[PDB]
């Protein structure tokens, strides 16, 4: 209830990872038969591609992220990663990433409880055997749920 266990924190972190990756990627793979508009445009000296239809509008993306990220985290995430709306469609800049952090095999150490927030430090083994990564994740109670307070806390 008023607590979040190590086990629960990892399950929430894995959901945040999937939502961040899918939103940056423009598509939730489990929504089948979505259509993905092709074509690019330039905006703010960045090259953009369109979200697929399942995340095709800001409203669709907000609803996708609401269960796992706080309201502030969602708004700041759109800003930090330069999402834009063009011709009524949500769009994201091109770019690259990798998934070297093996979050599913991580361990979580409690660091802090303050107010309605709990902070865990995760020790995350890597796919290439580089030193296990330290990643802090802060969870905030919002609308009766524990939610991650940074869009990019789990990558």
């Amino acid at each position: 209830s008023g607590d979040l266990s190590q086990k629960q924190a990892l399950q929430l972190a894995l959901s945040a990872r999937e939502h961040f990756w899918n939103t940056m990627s423009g598509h939730n793979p489990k929504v089948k038969k979505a259509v993905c508009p092709s074509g690019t445009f330039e905006y703010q000296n960045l090259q953009y591609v369109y979200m697929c239809s399942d995340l095709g509008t800001k409203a669709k993306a907000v609803n996708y992220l609401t269960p796992i990220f706080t309201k502030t985290a969602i708004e700041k995430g759109f800003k930090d990663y330069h999402f834009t709306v063009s011709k009524g469609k949500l769009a994201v800049p091109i770019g690259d990433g990798d998934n070297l952090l093996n979050w599913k095999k991580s361990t979580a150490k409690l660091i802090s409880k303050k107010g309605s927030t709990i902070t865990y430090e995760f020790t995350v083994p890597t796919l290439d055997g580089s030193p296990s990564a330290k990643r802090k994740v802060t969870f905030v109670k919002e609308n009766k749920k524990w939610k991650v307070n940074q869009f990019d806390a789990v990558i």
Partner: peptide, 22 residues
């Protein structure tokens, strides 16, 4: 530190944070 999908804004370049290709 890696900036996921980043390294192309003037701010990212100022801060010397990038993705693998940028």
């Amino acid at each position: 530190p890696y900036k996921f999908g980043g390294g192309r804004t003037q701010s990212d370049i100022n801060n010397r944070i990038f993705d693998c290709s940028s």
